[PDB]
């Protein structure tokens, strides 16, 4: 009925970053999260091992810098009433919206999650929801504009998702709350 789903990725440990922000680590504790959807770029099993301490169900797709080449390129999952698609995004050449709507139809999902830009974004179009959690470490990218650490928590109940977007802004964890309802 009620499911908390953690969505994160682009940690880039240890090449670009060595850990998640300590304030995030203090919030991410076992016993709460039912599933973890990861956009990839961990990049090593050490960060995979960390996620498995948080939840018994971890789903990951292959980022362009992951060490594990067995990770699938894309994943579709059904959680409650929602079909959720997952892809790292370094394959999306114009996060372009005509491409995302196409991917939404190809995966046949209510929610499409992707990463690779390290910029948190979320929007709704025609009763489909598109999420990018950003980088949970605030890892640098090419030509960046600052790059705030961020991750996403989805609160899924019946046909409503309430998404909480956690961001490390200055010295504080700050949150935005999003509602997504499907017909």
């Amino acid at each position: 009925d009620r499911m908390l789903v953690l969505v994160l990725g682009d940690l880039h440990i240890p090449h670009r970053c060595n850990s998640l922000p300590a304030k995030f680590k203090k919030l991410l504790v076992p016993g709460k999260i039912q599933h973890i959807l990861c956009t990839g770029n961990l990049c090593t099993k050490e960060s995979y091992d960390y996620l498995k301490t948080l939840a018994g169900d971890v789903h990951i797709v292959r980022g362009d810098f992951d060490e594990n080449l067995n990770y699938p390129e894309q994943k579709v999952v059904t959680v409650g009433q929602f079909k959720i698609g997952l892809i790292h995004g370094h394959q999306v050449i114009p996060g372009d919206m005509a491409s995302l709507a196409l991917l939404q139809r190809q995966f046949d999902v209510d929610i499409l999650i992707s990463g690779h830009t390290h910029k948190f974004e979320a929007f709704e179009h025609e009763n489909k929801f598109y999420i990018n959690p950003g980088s949970a470490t605030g890892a640098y990218n090419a030509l960046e504009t600052n790059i705030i650490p961020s991750f996403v928590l989805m609160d899924i109940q019946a046909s409503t998702v309430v998404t909480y977007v956690y961001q490390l802004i200055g010295d504080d964890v700050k949150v935005e709350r999003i509602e997504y309802k499907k017909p």
Partner: peptide, 16 residues
């Protein structure tokens, strides 16, 4: 202002 969340109470990140 502030927002209650499953992981605790935090400041809102909204620019307004």
């Amino acid at each position: 202002x502030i927002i209650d969340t499953p992981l605790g109470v935090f400041l809102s990140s909204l620019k307004r």
